[PDB]
Amino acid sequence: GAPATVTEQGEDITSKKDRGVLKIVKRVGNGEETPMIGDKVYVHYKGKLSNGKKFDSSHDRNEPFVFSLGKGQVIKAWDIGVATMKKGEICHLLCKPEYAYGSAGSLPKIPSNATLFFEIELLDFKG
Numbered sequence: 001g002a003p004a005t006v007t008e009q010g011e012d013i014t015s016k017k018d019r020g021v022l023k024i025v026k027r028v029g030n031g032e033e034t035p036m037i038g039d040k041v042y043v044h045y046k047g048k049l050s051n052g053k054k055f056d057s058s059h060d061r062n063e064p065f066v067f068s069l070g071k072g073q074v075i076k077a078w079d080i081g082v083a084t085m086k087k088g089e090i091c092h093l094l095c096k097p098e099y100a101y102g103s104a105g106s107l108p109k110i111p112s113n114a115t116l117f118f119e120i121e122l123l124d125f126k127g
């Protein structure tokens with residue numbers, strides 16, 4: 001399925017080249033511009049655990065998730081991966097625990113040592 005495909009066939013987008021964040025572009029976005037640090041970014045997403053459970057979905061809430069890019073308001077894999085996206089792009093991200101919730105996890109939903117899968121759509125970004 002999609003998590004296996006991004007694990008086996010995804011691009012390492014880390015600066016360390018440690019395969020901690022892997023990406024596949026699913027839907028090509030607009031032009032060349034990507035958001036910059038500090039921008040307000042608007043996304044839709046879904047998250048799955050490695051046991052196949054969906055743990056989160058913005059579509060199910062009928063409202064995008066909004067954050068300031070590159071400020072540690074989200075797990076590192078998101079600050080790294082969203083920064084690579086064009087407006088309108090949809091991508092898959094595979095997030096090793098060092099770029100997510102680590103050995104702590106995040107009670108109740110995220111276990112210790114969790115690899116996470118996301119599908120993310122960048123809706124918009126504004127200075």
Ligand SMILES: C=C[C@H]1CN(CC(=O)O)C(=O)[C@@H]2CCC[C@H]1N2S(=O)(=O)c1cc(Cl)cc(Cl)c1
Nearest residue numbers: 047055056065073074075078106107109110116
């Ligand atoms: C639910 C909102 C965010 C939570 N955070 C911020 C934080 O944990 O302080 C995140 O960094 C990431 C990425 C942005 C979207 C949300 N997750 S999440 O999907 O990994 C997540 C979902 C849920 Cl239901 C619980 C938890 Cl702990 C994390």
